[PDB]
Amino acid sequence: KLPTNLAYERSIDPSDVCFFVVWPDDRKTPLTYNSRTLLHQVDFCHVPYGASHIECSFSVSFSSELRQPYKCNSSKVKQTLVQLVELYETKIGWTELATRYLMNICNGKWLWKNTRKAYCWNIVLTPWPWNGEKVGFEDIRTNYTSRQDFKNNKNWSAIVEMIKTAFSSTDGLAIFEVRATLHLPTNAMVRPSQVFTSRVFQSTTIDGERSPILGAFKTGAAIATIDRVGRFGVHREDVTCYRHPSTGKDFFSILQQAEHYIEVLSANKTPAQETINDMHFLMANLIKGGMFQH
């Protein structure tokens, strides 16, 4: 069933996270880390003494690139996938995926372990296109800890709506610019991404000096952690992978049931236990993108 050529392009496009240090004068300087070597390289990054709060900013942009396959060897599977996307959108809606993708943006999941011992951290983002004030979340640790807590925000429906339109309409696009404010303790440990190769961080020069960074792919993993969404339910810490091919609930064993899913989505009310979750997994994998060649 899988054509010799079948590739999708990602719809969620996260960017790098750049850490900034805020002084009591409110002037901001890029965060810097020390490197120690023995005569083996170990990297240390801590909040400088006297710093008020660490600030992290990045931009994530949604797009409707899951509407049709980027490349497709055969025309039959192309219209099959397009009809599947249309039927899912019309019958189930993008609300669940939009909320799951937006909660990780707002609750600070992308900060990973940097929010472990912070007293309080705030998330304020400016969406685009926008027509009013910036969306603001205060004290995520205590205030916003659940779906109901997020929905009780002043304009939670408005922000999640523009993601639905971006996913639905062709050429539709929504851009967010997140800005975290971390009130870390004095000389608290900050944990950025470590480059593939001991502890050595990823670095990009900001304002003429190097700074620790969180990789764009690494931040995408936290944003897309909705189940991490992938072909198989791979778990990073515990090596074993769920949704194994034997379990019959991987991406491919679900993708090859496209005709059955098309029949189900149009016949009667789909079961919320089995078919709906499979549809959610299929569209979550489609949003991530990749190649399904063989």
């Binding site: 004068d25 002037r27 020390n34 490197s35 023995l38 801590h46 400088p48 003494y49 006297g50 000389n187």
Partner: protein, 197 residues
């Protein structure tokens, strides 16, 4: 004249860092419980990746050193086949003299030590002058240091686990003072007294 006795960590599965830390701990205890500080500590063998499998105590006074090596810890580890003790051997004239100086520089080179240094400067700013801004001070981009072992220690008056480190370096073969700090360190505030292998 100097006299020394040595002890070897018999088990192969052991952290000689931890064993040397415990040895220095009992040594410091003896150096307080009694007022004497005659006995120093030396390692006959030293490796860039780990401290040697033997630790040798060197003292100018024979009786003090022998009484030190009668401490309860050594006795209760001797019969357990974990320690092997040599009675006493006069210092050979063919031995070499090097100093196992403790380095206080690393405690400030580390990040929390840098924070402590800046906080100390802020407190000492009570000496009248324009209030400095911490933003000016910053940590070095790259730091390179020589090999060290950083044996390890825990304070007793307060529950702070300060880790002591020692750097080995050769020195002039003569120094008659035969004085040391609370631990044998060859970096006594007064002088850097060498010890033999």
């Amino acid at each position: 004249k100097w006299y020394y006795k040595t002890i070897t960590f018999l088990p192969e599965l052991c952290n000689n860092e931890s064993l040397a830390a415990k040895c220095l701990r009992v040594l410091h205890g003896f150096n307080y419980q009694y007022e004497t500080r005659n006995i120093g500590v030396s390692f006959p063998l030293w490796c860039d990746a780990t401290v040697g499998k033997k630790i040798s105590f060197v003292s100018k006074n024979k009786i003090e050193l022998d009484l030190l090596l009668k401490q309860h810890y050594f006795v209760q580890m001797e019969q357990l086949q974990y320690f092997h003790i040599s009675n006493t051997v006069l210092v050979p004239e063919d031995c070499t003299y090097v100093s196992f100086r403790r380095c206080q520089s690393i405690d400030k080179l580390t990040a929390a030590g840098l924070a402590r240094k800046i906080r100390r400067l802020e407190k000492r700013a009570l000496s009248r002058g324009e209030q400095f801004d911490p933003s000016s001070f910053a940590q070095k981009e790259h730091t390179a240091i020589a090999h060290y072992h950083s044996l390890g220690e825990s304070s007793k008056q307060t529950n702070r686990n300060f880790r002591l480190n020692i750097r080995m370096l050769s020195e002039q073969p003569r120094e008659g003072n035969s004085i040391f700090s609370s631990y044998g360190l060859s970096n006594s505030e007064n002088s850097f007294q060498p010890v033999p292998l």
